[PDB]
Design a protein around this ligand. Structure first.
Ligand SMILES: Cc1ccc(C)c(OC[C@@H](O)CN2CCOCC2)c1
Length: 377
């Protein structure tokens, strides 16, 4: 798996992408790695933000499916023409697969101006595939047509330019320290899990854990932030605020309506608490917890032209769709999407940003009763 190490790149805030090839002869493209969706979709027309795009006319192996797809989201969309073609991952396993490709022909607020990626690799399950679950996801096609074991793992580092590794079909023990702790995939649509307890600094929010997962809790490499349902966010923030009263901050800041700025190297992190999520374990009444630092929820905003200081965002926010464990969470950990056994493994990342005081941690076992009742029906 050393072939796959460091095979992800990116810029802060713009997501992590891997190099892929499509069609014959190979067209090289940088493709966003997204565990929060299930479509393999690539730019197929000269949108001006794009370095590159899929030229189907060049590919002997391309086959039109004579069906379109339309993918709306909040303030924007993409849409395209479905087909299949041969796909490889140069710094991945040594296979070639016939995959569904959504050739993106029109879009709105999808592509990022200044980004170096041109497509998206949805790694979640068929259930949430558009237009429907009959459209087989890439990773399904990859496993079905090859002897690649049914799992992948991600080490998202983020140092500006960010970096990481997507190990396809296996686990690289060099990417983590300590032991892997596993949480069940509640259902195969998103990578859905159950949070059973939340501690800020050690103290818990004392809320009906059912809330923590209203209506979902998911692991999503395509989201930057830790999202938290309305009520959980309220209490979450209420407590982080109390942990941090040493200095005063505006209301908008907590709502991600404004950024906060300190002077160069002048923001010791200790006015902010560590945050621990307890996840459902593999065994009845057994959990484990993952602990992240404020260096995870305080993310430097890359470049602001109207300033020169240490201006971080607050990487936590509300949600109507549920908890979303994004890069704020994932960059503390090596994460193993163990699809074969329906579970996600967390371990301390060999690359997470630690200091001389505190660290990201994964610890267990803990005893937690009624973890099932934490899941919404
Ligand atoms: C790069 C990009 C552009 C547009 C959209 C809508 C993107 O979303 C990526 C998804 O993984 C978003 N998550 C949000 C949480 O729920 C699952 C989908 C990415």
């Amino acid at each position: 798996f050393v072939e796959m190490v460091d095979n992800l790149r990116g810029k802060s805030g713009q997501g992590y992408y891997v190099e892929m090839t499509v069609g014959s002869p190979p067209q090289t493209l940088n493709i966003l790695v997204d565990t929060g969706s299930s479509n393999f979709a690539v730019g197929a027309a000269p949108h001006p933000f794009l370095h590159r795009y899929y030229q189907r006319q060049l590919s002997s192996t391309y086959r039109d499916l004579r069906k379109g797809v339309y993918v709306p989201y909040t303030q924007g969309k993409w849409e395209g023409e479905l087909g299949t073609d041969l796909v490889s991952i140069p710094h991945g396993p040594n296979v070639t697969v016939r995959a569904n490709i959504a050739a993106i022909t029109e879009s709105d607020k999808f592509f990022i101006n200044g980004s170096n990626w041109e497509g998206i690799l949805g790694l979640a399950y068929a259930e949430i595939a558009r237009p429907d679950d009959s459209l087989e996801p890439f990773f399904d096609s990859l496993v079905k047509q090859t002897h690649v074991p049914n799992l992948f793992s991600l080490q998202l580092c983020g140092a500006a330019s960010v970096g990481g590794s997507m190990i396809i079909g296996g686990i690289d023990h060099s990417l983590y320290t300590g032991s892997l702790w596993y949480t069940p995939i509640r259902r195969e649509w998103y990578y859905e899990v159950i949070i059973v307890r939340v501690e800020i600094n050690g103290q818990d929010l004392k809320m009906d854990c059912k809330e923590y997962n209203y209506d979902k809790s998911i692991v999503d490499s395509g989201t930057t932030n830790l999202r938290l349902p309305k009520k959980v966010f309220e209490a979450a923030v209420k407590s982080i605020k109390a942990a941090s009263s040493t200095e005063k901050f505006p209301d908008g800041f907590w709502l991600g309506e404004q950024l906060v700025c300190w002077q160069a190297g002048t923001t010791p992190w200790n006015i902010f608490p560590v945050i621990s999520l307890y996840l459902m374990g593999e065994v009845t009444n057994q959990s484990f917890r993952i602990t992240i630092l404020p260096q995870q929820y305080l993310r430097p905003v890359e470049d602001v032209a109207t300033s020169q200081d240490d201006c971080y965002k607050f990487a936590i926010s509300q949600s109507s769709t549920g908890t979303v464990m994004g890069a704020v969470i994932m960059e503390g950990f090596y994460v193993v999407f163990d699809r074969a056994r329906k579970r996600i493994g967390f371990a301390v990342s060999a690359c997470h940003v630690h200091d001389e005081f505190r660290t990201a941690a994964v610890e267990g076992p803990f005893v937690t009763l009624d973890m099932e009742d934490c899941g919404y029906n």
